[PDB]
Structure formats: C-alpha cells, structure tokens
C-alpha cells in the first residue's frame, strides 16, 4: 500500500478542487469584469486555466493511487475541458457553460457521497 500520498487528501482535494473550481468559475462566469465579456486574463480566469490543468494532472495522478474512481476522474476531466473551454471565450456561451454546470452536477453527485466516504473509510 504507497500511502506517499494520502488518499483522504487526494480525494478531499478532487471535491474541493472541482466544487471550489465550481465556485471560482461561477464568480467569474457571473462577474464579466465589464458588465458584458469577462477578461481571460482576470486572476479570476487564471485560477480556472490553471485549477483546469492543476486539476487535470492531479486526476491523471488521483487515478494513480486509485482505479476504481475513473468515472469520478473522468467526470472531473470532463469539468475541466468545459471550464477551459469556457473561460476560453471573452463571453461565456450558455451551452458549453450549462454543459460545466450539467458535469459539475454529477461531480458533486459522486463527490455528496458515493464512493467517497467508502474511499476516505478510517
């Protein structure tokens, strides 16, 4: 059992990198820094390019420690392609937005308590 990383913190970090993620993005998706587009460039926008990919790895890595959460990972992935994808325009389209947002549901579905708590046990 590598218990180099522990897996209670990877998980713990796969919800709140996603559902903070989640909140950061409403924050900006919410907040066009002009009333009408928002700045990729925002610190706002930063930390979701890089939350997006920070997270991205940190799957990749999650999955490491851990095979059985590939649908949770994948759903994450999922989350992040759209919140790049997203944040990747000046204003934010209500497809793709909606589409994060349909992802983030089922995210925080697995995340409410799945396999989560079966996974962080003792």
């Not at 926008?45 to 990919?53: A, G, K, P, R, S």
């Not at 095979?67 to 934010?92: A, R």
């Not at 793709?96 to 989560?116: A, V």
Request: hydrophobic share 35%.
């Amino acid at each position: 059992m590598d218990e180099y990383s522990p897996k209670r913190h990877d998980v713990a970090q796969l919800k709140f990198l996603c559902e903070s993620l989640y909140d950061e993005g409403i924050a900006t998706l919410g907040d066009s820094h002009h009333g009408w587009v928002n700045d990729p460039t925002s610190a706002v926008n930063l930390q979701l390019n890089d939350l997006i990919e920070h997270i991205a790895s940190f799957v990749m890595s999650f999955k490491i420690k851990y095979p059985d959460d590939g649908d949770l990972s994948e759903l994450v992935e999922e989350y992040l392609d759209d919140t790049y994808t997203l944040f990747s325009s000046y204003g934010i389209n209500d497809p793709e937005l909606q589409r994060w947002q349909k992802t983030k549901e089922r995210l925080f579905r697995l995340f409410s308590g799945e396999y989560i708590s079966t996974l962080m046990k003792t």
